[PDB]
Design a protein around this ligand. Structure first.
Ligand code: Y01
Ligand code: Y01
Lengths: 57, 57
C-alpha cells in the first residue's frame, strides 16, 4: 500500500509483548479460578464446567 | 527465559506510580462515598453496609 505495509510489518515485533501479557494473564486466571472454585463449591464431576468456571469466567 | 525475565524485573519500577494511583483513587472514593451516603440516606447502624456503600461501590 505504501501507507499500510509498514504498519502491518510492524506487527511482527509485538509478539514478545503479547506473549508476556498472555503468560501473566493465564497464570492469574488459573490461580484465581482454582481458588474461587475450591472456596465456594463442592466436588464437581463434570469436566466441561471445571474449565468453564476456572478459565472462561 | 531471556525474553520474559527483563519484563518481569521491570515490574519493580512501577510501584511508585501504582502507589500514587491508589492514593488518589482512595481519597476520591472516600470523599464521594461519604458525601453520597450522607446525602441520600439516614442513620445506618450496620457497620458492614457502611463500608459496602462507601468503599465497595
Ligand atoms: C458483508 C459480506 C457478506 C460481503 C463483503 C463486505 C464488504 C463490505 C467487504 C468485502 C471486501 C472488503 C474490502 C477489501 C479491500 C479493501 C481496500 C482497503 O484499502 C483501501 O481501500 C486503499 C488501500 C491503499 O490505500 O493502499 C480498505 C477496505 C476494502 C474496501 C475492504 C472493506 C470492506 C469490503 C468491501
Ligand atoms: C485448569 C487447571 C485445573 C490445571 C492447570 C491449567 C494449565 C492450562 C496451566 C498449568 C501450568 C501452566 C503453564 C506453566 C508454564 C508455562 C510455560 C510458559 O512459558 C513458555 O511456554 C515458554 C517460556 C520461554 O520462552 O522462556 C507459558 C505458559 C505455561 C505453558 C503455563 C500455561 C498454562 C498451564 C499449562
Amino acid at each position: 500500500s505504501r501507507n499500510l505495509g509498514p504498519k502491518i510489518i510492524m506487527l511482527q515485533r509485538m509478539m514478545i509483548d503479547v506473549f508476556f501479557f498472555l503468560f501473566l494473564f493465564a497464570v492469574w486466571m488459573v490461580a484465581f479460578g482454582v481458588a474461587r472454585q475450591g472456596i465456594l463449591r463442592k466436588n464437581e464431576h463434570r469436566w466441561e464446567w471445571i474449565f468453564r468456571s476456572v478459565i472462561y469466567e
